[PDB]
């Protein structure tokens, strides 16, 4: 029975085993539990070991007869006996043996009581026991995987079972020095991310990098191992803080370099903010395979998207410098020239765009404040390339009609038409730096940075004309040249450009919005790959910062720039620190809360705790109001995290706006503006219901500027969501107007939203990144924070240059195919085995060259699993030229 003396005296019976499996449990319920607890002597403990042989057979048998009523309260009690009635850090043999039938039984609670809350409770008890038992552990993982017995239940049990050692919660040192990593990695891919994050160290990942490389040949093929690496990194973004997280990314690179599977190494590099990595990468690429192959194509495609060499897009320097040696290599005149740059998508777009015809315009109304706006919207809509370029050559329409900063931010838009092309223009940014008058001239500098997008060409010369004007002590010319300086290159610095910027003659407390351009270029320049460790650079930010307290908008601009300095490599944060300490600022104290939050971003760990807090808002002192309002809004967070975390944030945000807006009016003005740009960057869940719903609520909230900021989210697939979003705001805008000012805002909101009728998916995102760090965000972000009641805001606002593609043109193993590929799309997942964004090939099908759509339909698999084709370069409708390893070529169209 469960009584004494059948396990407390050495004259005993194995009788309760008979009762348990269908009768009532007495042999994992509490007989074992009673005995262990009873006395303290190890003799009793010895009698429980004897019973285990019977228990293994009993356990499978009880699985087949499956009586869940019997499992639930009875097994809870087992937790007592294993760890807390042996201690199991001062007695090794006893908990080692008991786990053999017993570990599976504990697992039944783990599985049946499937929620997160229960998996964590059982995990702590488990980590100390698994670790103590080690080597024994290895037998138990295997026993489950093969199958314990064919039942519906074992299928769920095995993924739960491999998990328990991997938890690493409150785990003692005595046997804790053992790599568990290799058996766990092969069989299942769920347990592995948990292990890195919780270690929060180089070693988890070092052991992972080593194993992944051998898998290349040995386990499967290259494509499959690349795919496991992507799941691990995305989910390990929290429970590890940001300096710690940036290091994990460096170990991942080691794997890619070995592989012919390059794109992931580049996206990670953007986070680090290093030139160095790319330079080492082209050589390693060359070394591993003699052949051009996927390695050379993937590396090319991945860098073009955006890296580090100033603030946005992608440099010409490394491509020009390396293509002496790649020009020597000569594997194509046509192919390698085209592929390194963004050219193949550009060429296809420019030809289709022409046929379809996209005027890429605003209103047709002249001589009014009302079409200050429509000058800017021309640029915004054609921030993915257009063809207004024809009307623009005379310039009658926008430029002369506009005045002030309005003329400046107008003339940014000529160049904007020709961005992401192979000709920078030939009569409209050629001759507009040879058109009389300083407003067109400076503002055409602004255009000059834009036109060098990702491209290796530099068509119309960004760096040239700008090198000239920073020398000139003319303020207008200076501001324009520097904005382009940052925009053209990438995310950090270059040695020629950095030297050049060093003189300041600039603005330092001025009213005009355009004065803010200085702060962003300069902050990035200062941080290097591992710091330049040039002391002068930090100083120039401080000079403008120390001066300003006379203008609240300007006063805000410099702390954000200080914030950009911190962004980057873990070791780079320590290097820069020496420079910062020498001078001190009261200004830096208010600055710290936003500055912290930007630095923190890239991991949730530190990030969430600081954000959505009022620690430095009590709003009874002016310092407190400066950055604190924006920090609350949780702008940074959603992109950095995993796609599952994104789904919860959509709810939190909608409550969020209300909370801040009543809490502070000045805060409401700053915060709500940032809220619209947060949805576009973060990509939180759903887009079918959400902009329509949001337009209704924003009517209650103050400011016409809010509506303009919202329209940014409303882009996504640009003829799908956006037609509705525009019509709804249209009604309320037609409804009431009475000042030119409101009408101007409403006008920005309707047109900005656009890019429509056969024009592709455009949203702030590079496709490949979903680990990516903000540096493409900075130009709209600044504009959300500052006053949009000025027309001046419009220069920074013009650029939110980013692409996703509607192309599904995949490059075969040696086919290099230019034809498109059908795909299946689905909104949700049945598993986190997939989190590298591929769902099943059934679902609802979408075509080739047919609108690519974001959340609630973002996930994308190329439907062709039955044809056994795998993307090497991941599918989402990326900006990158897709690539596949084809074991069956391109699938045709399919009806459904």
């Amino acid at each position: 029975m469960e009584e004494g003396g059948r396990d407390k005296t050495p004259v005993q019976s194995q009788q309760p085993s008979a009762t348990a499996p269908s009768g009532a449990d007495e042999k994992s319920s509490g007989k074992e539990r009673r005995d262990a607890g009873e006395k303290d002597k190890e003799q009793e403990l010895s009698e429980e070991d004897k019973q285990l042989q019977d228990e293994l057979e009993m356990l499978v048998e009880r699985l087949g007869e499956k009586d869940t009523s019997l499992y639930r309260p009875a097994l809870e009690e087992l937790r007592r006996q294993i760890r807390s009635s042996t201690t199991s850090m001062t007695s090794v043999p006893k908990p080692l043996k008991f786990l053999r039938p017993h570990y599976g039984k504990l697992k039944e609670i783990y599985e049946n009581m499937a929620p997160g809350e229960n998996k964590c409770f059982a995990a702590d008890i488990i980590s100390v026991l698994a670790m103590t038992m080690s080597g024994e552990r290895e037998c138990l993982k295997y026993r489950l995987v093969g199958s314990q017995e064919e039942l519906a239940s074992w299928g769920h049990e095995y993924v739960r079972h491999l998990a328990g050692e991997v938890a690493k919660e409150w785990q003692e040192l005595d046997d804790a020095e053992k790599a568990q990593r290799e058996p766990l990695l092969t069989l299942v891919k769920e347990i592995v991310p948990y292990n890195m994050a919780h270690n929060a160290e180089h070693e988890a990942c070092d052991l992972l990098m080593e194993i992944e490389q051998v898998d290349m040949l040995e386990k499967d093929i290259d494509e499959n191992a690349y795919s496991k690496v992507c799941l691990y990194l995305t989910s390990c973004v929290n429970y590890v803080p940001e300096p710690e997280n940036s290091a994990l990314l460096r170990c991942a690179l080691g794997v890619f370099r070995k592989f012919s599977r390059f794109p992931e190494a580049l996206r990670l590099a953007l986070m680090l903010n290093d030139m160095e990595l790319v330079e080492d990468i082209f050589t390693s690429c060359k070394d591993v395979v003699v052949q051009k192959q996927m390695a050379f194509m993937l590396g090319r495609h991945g860098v073009f998207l955006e890296l580090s060499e100033d603030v946005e897009e992608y440099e010409d320097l490394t491509e020009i410098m390396s293509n002496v040696q790649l020009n020597s290599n000569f594997l194509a005149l046509a192919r390698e020239l085209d592929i390194m740059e963004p050219k193949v998508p550009d060429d296809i777009y420019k030809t289709h765009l022409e046929n379809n015809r996209f005027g890429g315009s605003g209103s047709q109304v002249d001589s009014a404040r009302m079409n200050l706006a429509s000058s800017f919207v021309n640029g915004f809509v054609n921030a993915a390339f257009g063809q207004d370029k024809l009307l623009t050559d005379d310039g009658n329409k926008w430029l002369y009609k506009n005045k002030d900063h309005g003329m400046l931010s107008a003339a940014a838009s000529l160049g904007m038409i020709l961005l992401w092309d192979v000709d920078g223009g030939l009569t409209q940014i050629d001759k507009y730096l040879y058109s009389s008058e300083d407003y067109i001239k400076s503002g055409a500098l602004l255009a000059c940075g834009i036109v060098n997008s990702g491209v290796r060409n530099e068509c119309d010369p960004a760096l040239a004309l700008l090198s000239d004007y920073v020398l000139h002590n003319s303020n207008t010319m200076r501001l324009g040249s520097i904005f382009g300086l940052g925009l053209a290159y990438a995310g950090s610095n270059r040695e020629d450009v950095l030297t050049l910027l060093l003189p300041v003659m600039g603005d330092s407390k001025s009213s005009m919005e355009v004065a803010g351009v200085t702060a962003l270029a300069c902050g990035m320049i200062a941080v290097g790959s591992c710091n330049g460790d040039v002391t002068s650079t930090i100083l120039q930010t401080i000079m403008e910062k120390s001066e300003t307290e006379l203008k609240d908008t300007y006063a805000r601009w410099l702390p954000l720039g200080l914030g950009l300095n911190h962004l980057g490599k873990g070791e780079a944060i320590e290097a820069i620190l020496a420079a910062l300490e020498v001078v001190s600022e009261p200004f830096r104290s208010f600055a710290n809360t936003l500055v912290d939050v930007c630095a923190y971003a890239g991991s949730g760990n530190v990030l969430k705790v600081q954000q959505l807090l009022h620690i430095c808002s009590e709003h009874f002192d002016s310092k407190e109001k400066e950055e604190d309002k924006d920090k609350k809004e949780k702008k940074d967070k959603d992109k950095k995290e995993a796609p599952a975390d994104m789904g919860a944030h959509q709810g939190v945000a909608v409550l969020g706006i209300a909370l801040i807006a009543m809490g502070e009016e000045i805060g409401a003005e700053m915060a709500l503006r940032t809220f619209g740009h947060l949805l576009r960057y973060g990509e939180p869940t759903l887009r079918r219901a959400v902009p329509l719903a949001l337009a209704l609520i924003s009517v209650s909230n103050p400011r016409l500027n809010i509506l303009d900021t919202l329209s940014k989210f409303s882009h996504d697939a640009d003829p799908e969501v956006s037609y509705n979003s525009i019509f709804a705001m249209g009604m309320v805008g037609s409804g009431t107007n009475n000042a030119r000012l409101a009408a101007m805002l409403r006008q920005l909101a309707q047109y900005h939203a656009k890019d429509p009728n056969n024009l592709f998916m455009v949203r702030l995102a590079q496709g490949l990144t979903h680990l990516g760090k903000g540096t493409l965000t900075l130009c709209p972000y600044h504009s959300d924070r500052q006053l949009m009641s000025q027309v001046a805001v419009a220069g920074l606002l013009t650029v939110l240059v980013s692409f996703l593609d509607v192309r599904n043109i995949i490059l075969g193993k040696s086919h290099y195919v230019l034809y498109g590929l059908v795909a299946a799309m689905q909104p949700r997942m049945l598993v986190t085995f997939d989190e590298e964004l591929r769902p099943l090939p059934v679902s609802v099908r979408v075509g080739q060259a047919v609108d690519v759509v974001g959340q609630a339909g973002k996930p994308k698999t190329i439907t062709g699993f039955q044809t056994h084709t795998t993307p090497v370069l991941l599918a989402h409708g990326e900006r990158a030229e897709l690539a596949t390893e084809e074991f069956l070529p391109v699938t045709p169209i399919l009806e459904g």
Partner: protein, 136 residues
């Protein structure tokens, strides 16, 4: 106390107190191995207080303080170390020869001028000092 100044003051302390408590439930940084610098927070903020009850011989009995142990000299022309209707009882108190104005007859019961002892000196007494003629 005056009500108005408190109301501004209360709001300030309080809004902080509740926000700190928000930060405490929120833990991610149980796992970490940071020395690379940028955070170096606990990422929890909390507050507490403790205070001591005592204050010596508050009231003799349940009724007001009245006579109490430990003796004082109080000079005349003090009413910010005043005489009280609770102090007739106190007066006497084994008075010293250092008081040159000390009892010679009974008590005055509630206030009045009381007997000053036959003076041989004027060291303890202080010269005349009306505020009468400087009022206007």
């Amino acid at each position: 106390e005056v009500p108005k100044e408190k109301e501004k003051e209360k709001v300030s302390t309080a809004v902080l107190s509740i926000t700190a408590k928000a930060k405490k439930k929120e833990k991610e940084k149980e796992k970490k191995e940071e020395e690379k610098m940028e955070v170096d927070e606990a990422e929890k903020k909390e507050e507490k207080e403790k205070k001591k009850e005592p204050e010596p011989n508050f009231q003799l009995l349940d009724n007001p303080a009245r006579v109490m142990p430990a003796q004082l000299k109080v000079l005349s022309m003090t009413e910010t170390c005043r005489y009280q209707p609770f102090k007739p009882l106190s007066i006497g108190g084994i008075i010293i020869l250092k008081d040159t104005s000390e009892d010679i007859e009974e008590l005055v019961e509630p206030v009045a001028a009381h007997g000053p002892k036959i003076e041989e000196e004027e060291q303890e007494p202080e010269p005349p000092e009306p505020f009468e003629y400087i009022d206007d």
